[PDB]
Design a protein around this ligand. Structure first.
Ligand SMILES: N[C@@H](Cc1c[nH]c[nH+]1)C(=O)O
Ligand SMILES: N[C@@H](Cc1c[nH]c[nH+]1)C(=O)O
Ligand SMILES: [Co+2]
Ligand SMILES: [Co+2]
Lengths: 700, 699
């Protein structure tokens, strides 16, 4: 009962008032646990120590978890009065961004007693909210209870991450507390071995209507197939890692990847971060105690050290050994039939959720099938940088919880440690760290031929690429249907009963019309002057999805993911994208039954030359289709080379009349059509234009 | 005889096929007359003489009136086949801009041009026979283009006869078809006769009978007082006193424009006076004869104006040239009959129905006056201008708009050779003040000071867009934005004081004038001096004119006239240039301050919200609209009100407004308001502004 309340709450309870008391007790117990964590600091002066250079002092996180409640309840408009706006700014945002290179004090921290009194006032506000706020089932993302739970599961994250910081604090500044006792059993390190793990269909990703609270990075759908592989029986113990250290592992550059080698030489690292050099031997550092080395406990390493061990072990065993991917750990868990939190008894079946120890335990204590410590004890590093599943959607109250970590620099860790609580002990939760950062994290190694495919990280934010991604793959504005798609549908319309072997899409941009044309034309080529546009158009064709940000106001953005629909995914093999200047096309681009050029002719420096060159490249009786708003400007075209918008012989020359004039000898005008299109700039500013489509047929 | 066919055709005929034959005869007769004019050139070589340095040689206008038909029939898609595109470009456009192009280069041969005109004649003759005729004739009818080509040629019949009259006497040949008047005597003494004032109302309705150019349509009303006009036109003999008194030698009589022209041409005598020993001889179209002292004199405006200034000094009275309204008043007072009421012979020396020259000023009487119409054109002091309701014809959109430059003064009455549309009362012709025509002048005595507005059309891209934004049409069905915002301001101020209001970022002031309908005093402020000038111009003059882009350099001529309900509240409005971030302290004590689409265009919007609060009365309303397009082009990121993250949470713009306006204002409501800004005929900005309505704390 003392630590069982730290398990994540099942939210689909039969009674709403029974769920109220569970959330009330889940909040106070989490608040109590975090405040009890700092009782391991010797005195109030130790709150202002910075144990990890890449993080704040303890005092910041002491108030940060309470301030986080107020800032989210104010932003969600659940409450309207702040408790202390001064403190709520100073404890606002933590620090990531640690390239292992640095804040220099210059912070005026409140006193420890000041922060204690503030935290107590946050507790009554939330307690009053839990008492007075209506509870409507089921709990949705819009429900105010989601924000309260967000503060709870965020505080539980800081329970673990501050315990690492305490474990990194000078031993003279910490005080052992019986509420945070260590494991007292340790012995000989067992001999690890590689055991068989079967492959199969991996299917992870949380649906929107699943039961527990979850962060945004948990939701989506991800499927892949991994082969049969081998995983180590135990986590890598201190003793197993001791062989690597005694074989000059930190001295031999052959084992260290280029990033880890750079980190190792900067830190001048010679041994794991919680190994204390003692004469010719090594001692071990728990949260608040220095004890003799427990050789059968797991080792604590960042990614670089664990990877260096795997490269060293590969040379000894003569076999390719590496860290697992996230999918391989999920396969291992399912193969071992690890039970979810909802099926646990009075005690957790792993060293987890603070239900057994406030430190690691022997790697031989908790078994799961043929394996040990599949969950619990310490985190297990992976080689998969955290990434959003297909269907990922941010929560509006914390839109940047995970999206800044989608940078191919935060490697996923699985299993959870002895102190991982709440959301962290769910199977669907996904936590990641910079590959140099230290936690209660070790590693299990695998032997696998599986080569995981990593995609481009982050979201594209170049304003020009963002707009045209939205223009071809975004939503409809003012009820105007998709312009690249509508144009392509008209191309398919006016070519019924006509040849459809080859088609060319000049000015294809992000290639929506190109893929739409490929549904009826056997070979379609997309050309655009922008190498950036072609890169995104090819990425959508290969990967089947693109990610980008569109502006709402100023620097604020919305995160968008455009996924290729099933009907367009079939025809990706009929599409090619190339960078090309429409006024000097390579001779290889010829023999087309249809050439489409959308919003292009009024953007070319010599549109007459393009019309003269593209005619020689269309088959007899082929179709040339042009759309343009006729925005003639000296920015793109010299006035002498405009097709319209000027007076000659005292009569106005309209652009459509100039098009007949340049296409008189070789083309015939079928029809003209007016087509609206909308290009989004911000959430409130758009371009709304009426382009003219002109449909031409080649003279036989 | 057959000269009646040159009268303008009444288009509301009983039968459509009777109008066809009238137009058929009107075309051939006009085509015949223009070609008969150049028989007064002695040989083909004279076609390449340039009599007037500000115009082309005769050969150009010889083929121009035929090329005009083809170019208009091609542009209006009435025909699709050109006769000679090479010549249709050489004879395409004449030249104006003749302030005191195509030099001495190779023109087509005279025989080449003859054969071309003949092929043009059968194309038009074919069209007149085969085109369907639907009554009534409209601007969209193909018969309007044919009438346009006919009436354009009649203009060149008169203007080319001037050029012939300016041609060296050795290169012209008198023709019996163009005989002069042979009667002349002593000049009578002119006198000023009474002309009554009253209500002047001119302007052609769209559904009126005759063919007319664009500058004839619209409505113009004014009131002029009683005045006096000279009984006769100024004769050579009357003008001779001015010339013998050193008129061309005395600078006191010449206005600045005319003095500069006279020194440039070294003018010592009228243009058609030939100095012979100590006397002067006279030049008709093709003959040099003794001075007909009782014929009217041929002068430009500068010479006519200098005569009036000289006569003002002699008589001790303010004598000037009439304004166009005054000539129309003299015409109505003398009961001059319209062309539709004429008998077999015109009641004036006009329409080539009497002479190919001027005649004595004592010949044609109209009431107590002579030559109210006919004989020679009569100069005015009115630069030509479009009436309210002026609309161009798409086939010839620049026929008159380039003359709306305050430099082309109107001339009225017509001359002996004015034909067709020129002899209608509603027709309006104008020339640059230095230009020479068969034009004389009557003088007047009047204290009436005519008001002249700003000429031309505004073409600066920004001023055009915001003129269209405040005073143009609706696009995508979106209601006028400055007007809608002002109406909402009135809405949310019901039961509140309405003494003084301020419109910051007023642009062309549509919202400012709209606010004046319920606010006793409205002040409009804007950073752009160009905008404030146009806003004040709309307030004083009641109308503004600007061009909006269709494609490239092509434009659309727009006229925004102040509506009747806003003209009443004009006296309550002030327009001043001002920087909203550093306002002068005199702008204060407002019951409403409205700022449309401004805060995200200011360098320091927070400072503006702090300054403007001090200047609103207790319980007054502050209303802001903005799309929140925050950009470092206008505002440093540090001074944004929204669109940024702080303390790890997003700050939306409306929440930043509440934060800055917390101490002094209360948010009443917010509304989304769409607006459209036109860039071209096909490109627009379509945005959704948020209107935030704030009320100041009572204490
Ligand atoms: N991206 C942040 C999310 C976070 C905020 N607080 C705790 N965790 C991180 O990895 O640390
Ligand atoms: N604005 C021109 C109109 C015109 C063309 N041709 C004859 N007239 C002019 O006054 O001369
Ligand atoms: Co945090
Ligand atoms: Co002309």
């Amino acid at each position: 009962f003392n630590k069982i309340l730290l398990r994540p709450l099942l939210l689909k309870q039969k009674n709403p008032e029974n769920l109220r008391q569970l959330i009330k007790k889940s909040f106070h117990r989490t608040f109590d646990t975090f405040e009890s964590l700092f009782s391991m600091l010797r005195n109030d002066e130790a709150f202002y120590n910075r144990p990890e250079p890449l993080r704040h002092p303890h005092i910041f996180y002491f108030g940060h978890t309470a301030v986080f409640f107020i800032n989210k309840l104010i932003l969600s408009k659940i409450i309207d009065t702040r408790i202390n706006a001064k403190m709520e700014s100073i404890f606002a945002i933590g620090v990531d961004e640690m390239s292992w290179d640095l804040n220099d004090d210059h912070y005026e921290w409140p006193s420890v007693e000041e922060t204690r009194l503030y935290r107590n006032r946050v507790r009554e506000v939330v307690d009053n909210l839990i008492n007075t706020l209506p509870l409507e089932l089921p709990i949705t993302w819009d429900s105010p209870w989601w924000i309260i739970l967000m503060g709870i599961e965020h505080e539980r994250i800081h329970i673990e991450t501050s315990s690492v910081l305490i474990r990194q604090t000078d031993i003279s500044l910490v005080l052992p507390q019986p509420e945070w006792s260590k494991c007292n059993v340790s012995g000989k390190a067992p001999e690890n071995e590689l055991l068989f793990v079967p492959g199969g269909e991996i299917e992870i990703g949380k649906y929107k209507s699943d039961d527990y609270y979850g962060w945004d990075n948990e939701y989506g759908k991800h499927k892949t197939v991994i082969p049969d592989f081998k995983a180590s029986k135990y986590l890598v113990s201190n003793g197993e890692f001791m062989e690597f250290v005694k074989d000059g592992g930190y001295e031999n550059d052959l084992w260290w990847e280029e990033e880890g080698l750079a980190w190792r030489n900067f830190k001048k690292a010679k041994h794991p971060i919680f190994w204390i050099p003692f004469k010719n031997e090594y001692r071990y550092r728990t949260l608040t105690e220095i004890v003799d080395m427990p050789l059968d406990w797991p080792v604590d390493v960042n990614y670089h050290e664990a990877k260096a061990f795997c490269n060293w072990l590969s040379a000894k065993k003569g076999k390719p050994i590496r860290l697992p991917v996230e999918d391989e750990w999920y396969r291992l868990k399912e193969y071992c039939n690890v039970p979810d939190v909802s099926k646990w008894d009075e005690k957790a079946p792993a060293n987890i959720n603070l239900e057994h120890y406030a430190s690691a335990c022997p790697v031989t204590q908790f078994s799961f099938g043929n394996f040990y410590d599949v969950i619990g004890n310490v985190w297990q590093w992976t080689e998969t940088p955290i990434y959003p599943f297909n269907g990922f959607k941010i929560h509006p109250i914390y839109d940047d919880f995970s999206t800044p970590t989608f940078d191919n620099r935060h490697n996923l860790i699985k299993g959870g440690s002895f102190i991982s609580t709440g959301n962290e002990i769910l199977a669907s939760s996904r936590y990641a760290f910079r590959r140099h950062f230290f936690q209660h994290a070790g590693f299990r190694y695998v032997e696998s031929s599986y080569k995981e495919k990593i995609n481009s990280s982050g979201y594209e934010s170049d304003t020009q690429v963002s707009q045209y991604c939205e223009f071809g793959w975004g939503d409809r504005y003012f009820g105007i249907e998709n312009y690249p798609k509508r144009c392509a549908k008209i191309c398919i319309e006016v070519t019924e009963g006509k040849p459809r072997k080859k088609a060319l899409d000049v000015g294809c941009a992000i290639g929506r019309s190109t893929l739409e044309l490929a549904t009826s034309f056997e070979s379609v080529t997309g050309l655009d002057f922008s190498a950036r546009f072609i890169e995104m158009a090819e990425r959508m064709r290969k990967d089947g999805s693109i990610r980008y940000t569109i502006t709402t106001e100023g620097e604020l953005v919305e995160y968008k993911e455009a996924t290729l629909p099933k009907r367009l995914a079939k025809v990706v093999d009929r599409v090619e994208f190339w960078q090309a200047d429409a006024c000097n096309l390579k001779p290889i681009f010829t023999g087309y039954d249809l050439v489409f050029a959308g919003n292009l002719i009024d953007r070319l420096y010599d549109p007459a030359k393009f019309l003269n060159d593209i005619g020689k490249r269309i088959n007899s009786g082929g179709m040339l289709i042009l759309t343009s708003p006729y925005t003639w400007l000296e920015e793109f075209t010299p006035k002498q080379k405009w097709l319209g918008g000027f007076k000659q012989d005292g009569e106005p020359v309209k652009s459509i009349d100039g098009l007949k004039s340049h296409l008189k000898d070789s083309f015939k005008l079928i029809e003209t059509r007016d087509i609206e299109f909308v290009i989004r700039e911000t959430a409130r500013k758009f371009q709304h234009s009426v382009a003219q489509m002109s449909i031409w047929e080649k003279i036989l």
